[PDB]
Amino acid sequence: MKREAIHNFFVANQIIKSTADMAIFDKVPATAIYEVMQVRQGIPLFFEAHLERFVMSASLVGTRIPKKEAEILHNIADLVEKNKCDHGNVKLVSALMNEKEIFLAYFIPAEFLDSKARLEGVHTILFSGERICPNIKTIKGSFREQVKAVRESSNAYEALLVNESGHITEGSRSNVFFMGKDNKLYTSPAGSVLKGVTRTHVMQICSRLGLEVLEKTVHTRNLADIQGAFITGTTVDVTPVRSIGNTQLDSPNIPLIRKIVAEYEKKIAGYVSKRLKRARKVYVND
């Protein structure tokens, strides 16, 4: 695990440390459970969704998350305050073993979807690898380091992971979806992937919208029969895919891909604005 926090301060178990003192990163084991959230205008985005995964992952694995809801909010709010920053990505790491508990909360670098990428969609590549404890967002679980070199010398915004069996699972930080030659929606199924928050939103939207998403094992060879792809995820929203290694797609020109994108943006805006509205009613009759 790298000394990965940005800005000036992070949290380490209810103490605010400065990012000039990052040694605690070294003590973090690969079994640590994490979460990433967007902060937008000081609102941790889909907090309830993330904490439910965080808590429920812990519980199912057989640890505990050391901190209750109210405290995690307090930690995020101090990172926002101490860092003089109300937008970016926040990471929460949890590890506990009988006394020896480590909870970290901190900003990491944000992606910026360039011009090219916004109109064309993103370049992506294939990476051969499968995630240990894939149902769980763990340190062990993260492909990020594995795929650094590759991604850069590629201009690829995501490395899509490939099994033994030559199925495309998920992105290193994203769920992937596919539009059939057929115009049916495909994603790799639940049990081969991380149950993404945003995956879940996309599923719900598709379903409001009336295209069912067919959960389905997708091979390397199936790339011929695919007209579009998108990637989902906290750090990447719903991003159109222009290309997968060599296979060009024209994902931004499928009317449905665009529809989902926008549908998601709406959800974010309405989440944030619900919150900020409440806070303000609360400032008003103070």
Numbering used by the authors: 1 to 286
Paper's wording?
Here, we describe a monomeric PLP-dependent fold type IV transaminase found in a marine aromatic-compound-degrading sulfate-reducing bacterium Desulfobacula toluolica Tol2. To the best of our knowledge, this is the first active monomeric PLP-dependent enzyme among the known fold type I and IV transaminases. The new monomeric transaminase (DtolTA) is stereoselective and active toward D-alanine and (R)-phenylethylamine. The results show that the active site of the transaminase, formed by a single subunit, is active in PLP-catalyzed deamination but is insufficient for double-substrate transamination.
